[PDB]
Design a protein around this ligand. Structure first.
Ligand SMILES: CSC[C@H]1O[C@@H](n2cnc3c(N)ncnc32)[C@H](O)[C@@H]1O
Ligand SMILES: CSC[C@H]1O[C@@H](n2cnc3c(N)ncnc32)[C@H](O)[C@@H]1O
Ligand SMILES: CSC[C@H]1O[C@@H](n2cnc3c(N)ncnc32)[C@H](O)[C@@H]1O
Ligand SMILES: CSC[C@H]1O[C@@H](n2cnc3c(N)ncnc32)[C@H](O)[C@@H]1O
Ligand SMILES: CSC[C@H]1O[C@@H](n2cnc3c(N)ncnc32)[C@H](O)[C@@H]1O
Ligand SMILES: CSC[C@H]1O[C@@H](n2cnc3c(N)ncnc32)[C@H](O)[C@@H]1O
Ligand SMILES: CSC[C@H]1O[C@@H](n2cnc3c(N)ncnc32)[C@H](O)[C@@H]1O
Ligand SMILES: CSC[C@H]1O[C@@H](n2cnc3c(N)ncnc32)[C@H](O)[C@@H]1O
Lengths: 261, 261, 261, 261
């Protein structure tokens, strides 16, 4: 079908991209970066996240594939030496699709903005103390004081979430995971401490206590939001679809990245 | 239907148990501790775990309810002052049932024993260094050296799992969670560090490296197993059923036990 | 001798301050906020840190005392109801002095600025990834990637340091403690993980890898530093002196703040 | 002077030991394993700990040296290829000595036993729940419930202590460090969480609450102690002395073992 290729933009990735486009030229395949059905990302996980956000409006019409020009990625999990075999199998089609859960972030003001994250969304203070009330399904759960909070998708769990002590979750689980950044706990201040894992349909809302300005991140994007009344998290109805050409199990990808490769 | 009541065995719990049996005497309800359809446990979570293991062969024919004579429990989540209202509503029936996932542990030797856990199963060494190979769905994932490992159900996540840094998981998620106890990590030895969350149908197998004797726990029961060839973990096909009489959400129960009550 | 009193500036603290000044009026004591020998801080630990930084140039000529108008402080460890007894004993003098270690931070550019911290100094990135080389006594120890680093004095250990997993250290130990904020560790990136405790005379230097802009904090003060070549940490030669009027051991103060009071 | 050599007992270590004894035969050096002044340990850190405990009664008359036949050790920090140069320099003498702090453990019953640890002493329960009262300098600090507690020397901090989240402390600091093993913290149970670092002269006492049987370890030795009334920890007056032949800084040894070598 229609396809496009994004590149990290270094010499290696651009050449690999030109070679695949030449290869695709020998099949019924049209290059179209407006309405692709296949999006190939050549670079690291940073490049793959950008590809995801470039096409987040057509997630259900796109299958993603990632090629790693440097080290193994979690999203960019094919090697370059296999580009030609990838060209071949993508051209024929008939490939299986694999779907991972995504996170919906809603920011309400005194309008409303919604974002989709593939890894995570984080909340930190503008320039002072961070204090927020955490409300779960309309029930007040804790008053959080500390550096910030992180809400991760399952495939996000190997990223920022892991650095904050979160658990690694297989991406077939439709869930989101909330971790703390440097929480204060003394006689007067009290948080759960532990990461929290939420199923689909649960809503976690962060509400300002004093300061209403916050730094909010979604994957790579970080934006100062002013006059915030609420930040809301829930597992998205939308999913990201990967074109699958061979078996590469999530736990093997974890082993290869963290234990040994 | 037929019901029974277990007691922690202190003065408070026994009296409460005698009072409920007297109350049940005013309805069509037969006391039968052989084939009950309702099992009321009066005591702490320790008492409730024993009630679960007393009837683990008839899980699909029993609905459990727990009354806490001391502090709030996660399983024993009704107060004693409400015993009479509980008598009433249990007698009529028509109550809703709530189901939580369980963990299947299989121990293989050079026969085979299987256990069901409501909280967790743990593995530690007999008397020396603990070294085991962790294999996930037949893929070698890590060689673990340290004090031990813990595999938790979702309702188990607030117990031993929490103490070991694991995440708290809503019990509607069909999953198990593996946490490390004091893992060694240096130049030569390497584990994932992070807790790992597994969906239904994934199989985690622990295999001996040198010593084949291990201390294996399942909830309260701890047994030295000799001549072990494998310990296997998977989400059970079986579930524990709770009689539900009012709303008491899992996250509110977490708040009440860990943040404030 | 000469004394001054700083206030949190709320109604309670100002009144208490006016009452102590009236009380001091009945002894040979002169109010002088230029060259005091006694500095009384009335408020929380935030107020006490400001008092410390107001007089950091005359540390060896000043004995500090803190009164807590709200909850117990670590520095502001006297109750208000005891103000009059404090007036009395401070007036006579002959009190013992207690000394705690401080941290020296040196920031070098392409000039040089030095700061003194009572709690800690932290380093975070301006707006992008944080990557720094950590050099200990001229030996390259690790390349750190993550959110930031924190260097704590012993009395600082109960503050930000504690939130980041650091150990609590008795303040009679002349040392500083380095903790990580959200370090990345995978196949390619590698940090020690654990907090590190350094004795007097050891020098820890942070050196930029790519970006040379950093957010540097010292206690309450947070400043964006541009064109940084090095951040250097060492236990200061200077100490903060407390006027001691009764026994209140550090570990009891830890118990009272974190376990129960 | 008089010297002896202990071996791990594998083929490599025994041969290396025979070669050094032959080499020492060309100098004024007498082999004496009763009253040596130099103790050479050839093997891992396990072998070196045994050498330490073999001669713990003559610590002030002995200088230790460790050769690693396998991977780098923290105590056994010389390579085998340098045995001959070690022979040479040890024979002449005039070498500098380096001293590390040790931990004194006292166990009181309803007599009294004292032990010296080079790494750590740990306390765990015999077979049930572990509950102990932690008393610091006669002040009740916390009631600890969980798996156990670990008290580490500074050179011990890179061992068991590190696995439990403790800080790594330079061995020139005369201190001991207490870490928790799987502490329970809920509404009803409360521990400090954080590792605690104690200076010389502070006394930490563990006192039984219910069960008075405990598994107590000191380095490699693990013993079930019955009828325990108290376990007492303090920095020892005794020190272990190392023969120093070249510079190998503690932090470089940490880097080489944990970051890269
Ligand atoms: C160093 S900043 C983030 C690092 O983690 C990588 N990363 C990005 N997303 C993920 C993910 N989902 N899982 C693991 N690593 C990730 C990035 O490629 C980079 O190496
Ligand atoms: C792939 S580049 C963007 C990703 O970097 C990852 N990241 C940012 N900061 C950290 C950190 N301190 N540790 C691990 N990953 C991080 C976040 O998961 C983000 O989605
Ligand atoms: C102190 S040993 C275990 C403690 O945790 C409690 N407990 C048992 N099971 C659970 C659970 N599933 N979640 C939280 N606490 C539990 C027990 O009642 C006891 O307080
Ligand atoms: C309710 S009594 C049995 C439970 O005690 C809990 N338990 C045992 N040891 C610990 C611990 N160190 N921390 C928290 N819970 C524990 C385990 O989850 C077990 O199922
Ligand atoms: C909530 S931001 C910092 C919190 O920790 C307190 N704090 C400041 N310094 C210290 C310290 N050295 N030890 C413990 N708490 C501190 C402050 O008073 C406030 O409660
Ligand atoms: C007393 S107000 C200033 C202090 O707040 C403390 N602080 C800032 N952020 C945090 C945090 N996330 N956790 C604990 N303490 C903090 C730092 O130790 C600082 O010195
Ligand atoms: C695997 S059991 C202990 C492991 O830690 C090593 N070890 C023993 N003592 C120390 C120490 N003081 N610091 C670091 N590692 C140690 C042992 O040699 C072994 O590799
Ligand atoms: C060198 S062999 C003895 C040492 O093994 C180390 N050890 C035992 N168990 C562990 C563990 N789980 N993690 C790290 N080190 C350990 C302890 O520090 C002990 O002194």
């Amino acid at each position: 079908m229609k396809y496009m290729i994004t590149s990290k933009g270094d010499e290696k990735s651009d050449l690999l991209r030109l070679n695949m486009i030449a290869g695709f030229g020998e099949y019924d395949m049209e290059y179209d970066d407006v309405e692709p059905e296949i999006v190939i990302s050549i670079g690291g996980d940073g490049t793959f996240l950008s590809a995801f956000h470039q096409y987040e409006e057509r997630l259900d019409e796109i299958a993603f594939i990632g090629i790693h020009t440097g080290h193994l990625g979690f999203y960019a999990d094919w090697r370059p030496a296999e580009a030609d075999k990838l060209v071949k199998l993508l051209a024929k089609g008939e490939y299986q699709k694999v779907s991972y859960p995504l996170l919906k972030t809603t920011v309400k003001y005194g309008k409303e903005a919604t974002y989709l994250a593939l890894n995570e969304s984080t909340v930190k203070s503008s320039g002072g103390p961070f204090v927020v009330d955490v409300v779960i399904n309309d029930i007040h759960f804790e008053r959080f004081r500390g550096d910030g909070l992180c809400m991760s998708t399952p495939s996000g769990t190997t990223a920022y979430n892991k650095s904050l002590g979160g658990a690694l979750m297989h991406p077939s689980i439709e869930a989101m995971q909330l971790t703390e950044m440097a929480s204060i706990n003394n006689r007067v201040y009290r948080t759960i401490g532990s990461p929290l894992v939420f199923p689909k349909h649960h809503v976690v809302s962060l509400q300002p206590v004093n300061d209403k300005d916050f730094q909010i991140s979604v994957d790579h994007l970080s934006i100062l939001h002013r006059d915030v009344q609420e930040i809301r998290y829930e597992v998205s109805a939308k999913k990201i679809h990967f074109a699958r050409f061979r078996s590469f199990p999530f736990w093997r990808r974890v082993h290869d990245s963290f234990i040994e490769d």
